[PDB]
Ligand binder design. Structure first.
Ligand SMILES: CCCCC[C@H](O)/C=C/[C@@H]1[C@@H](C/C=C\CCCC(=O)O)[C@H]2CO[C@@H]1C2
Ligand SMILES: NCCc1c[nH]c2ccc(O)cc12
Length: 295
């Protein structure tokens, strides 16, 4: 059974797709951000088309494996949040039917846009209700469910408060200083963090995601070294890959990467809004939190 997406998940999708497809220029990027924020799939060009493909696949309305829309997932998305939604039976019926009629002829950006575009023009507001595409609807859901990570909340402090609670402050302090204490709480902590960073999904590690956090610190040159390590790690548990990285010649680079990613986890739109990498600010922020934790 397919599981509906949380507002954390869809916000991850939206921000990641914008990161991947917004142009690096300035005059160009502003148009795209302004339009996409209003859910306007304009202007119609390769940038917008591939952004559309990326969102459609992150929301998982389009299946890359089966290479086809899976319309039943619409229904799923709705039932999971059918009261907080604001969506009606008729709206979801028609949206599901329209998506059921789509056979895009291929899976390129251009063809998927050409297929789905009239559906989006017609049912954009249904899509925004179902997939938490408004600040009000997402806020309603967050408020209904205390187990979801919030917008401005760090993945790491979230996972800490779920895994350690108010117990083992000493082990949590050592863990936040990158100690391999080997305790059960630290293992669950690293699993929680890897799941939320998408370093691991459905049990399989995601080497491209770690590599990308290495690129984000201007250490792309380490990508091969980051692959060897992860491809040679014999375990399958997050703590295994974590320890492989910490007990390596790229330990300190890994900490720089991890800390930047923590900072960017407390605000999914960090790169969209235009923030850049600043090792000093990153570590200053980390030092404030760690001095509080180890207080
Ligand atoms: C099928 C294609 C749909 C196009 C995608 C659409 O262009 C989405 C844009 C995202 C939006 C989602 C809106 C609200 C979600 C809640 C955001 C919040 O918690 O502040 C904003 C957050 O990333 C961007 C801007
Ligand atoms: N800023 C890095 C936070 C971090 C990295 N590894 C950790 C392990 C435990 C913990 O509580 C926190 C952490």
């Amino acid at each position: 059974r397919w599981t509906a997406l949380t507002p954390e998940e869809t916000l991850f999708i939206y921000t990641r797709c914008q990161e991947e497809h917004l142009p690096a220029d300035n005059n160009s990027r502003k148009t795209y951000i302004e339009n996409w924020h209003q859910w306007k799939l304009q202007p119609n060009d390769h940038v917008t088309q591939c952004y559309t493909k990326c969102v459609l696949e992150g929301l998982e309305l389009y299946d890359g494996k089966q290479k086809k829309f899976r319309p039943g997932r619409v229904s799923s998305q709705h039932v999971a949040y059918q009261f907080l939604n604001g969506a009606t039976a008729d709206e979801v019926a028609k949206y599901k039917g329209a998506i059921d009629a789509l056979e895009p002829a291929s899976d390129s950006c251009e063809d998927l846009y050409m297929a789905y575009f009239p559906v989006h023009e017609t049912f954009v507001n249904v899509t925004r209700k179902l997939y938490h595409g408004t600040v009000e609807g997402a806020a309603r859901v967050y408020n209904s469910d205390p187990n979801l990570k919030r917008k401005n909340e760090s993945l790491f402090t979230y996972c800490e408060k779920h895994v350690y609670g108010d117990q083992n402050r000493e082990d949590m302090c050592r863990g936040r200083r990158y100690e391999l204490t080997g305790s059960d709480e630290l293992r669950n902590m690293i699993e929680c963090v890897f799941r939320g960073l998408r370093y691991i999904k459905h049990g399989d590690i995601n080497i491209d995601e770690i590599v990308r956090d290495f690129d984000h610190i201007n250490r792309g040159d380490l990508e091969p070294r980051v692959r060897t390590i992860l491809s040679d790690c014999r375990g399958i548990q997050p703590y295994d890959y974590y320890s492989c990285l910490i007990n390596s010649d790229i330990r300190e680079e890994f900490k720089l990467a991890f800390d930047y990613r923590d900072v960017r986890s407390a605000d999914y739109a960090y790169i969209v809004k235009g923030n850049t990498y600043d090792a000093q600010k990153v570590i200053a922020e980390m030092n404030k939190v760690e001095k509080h934790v180890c207080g």
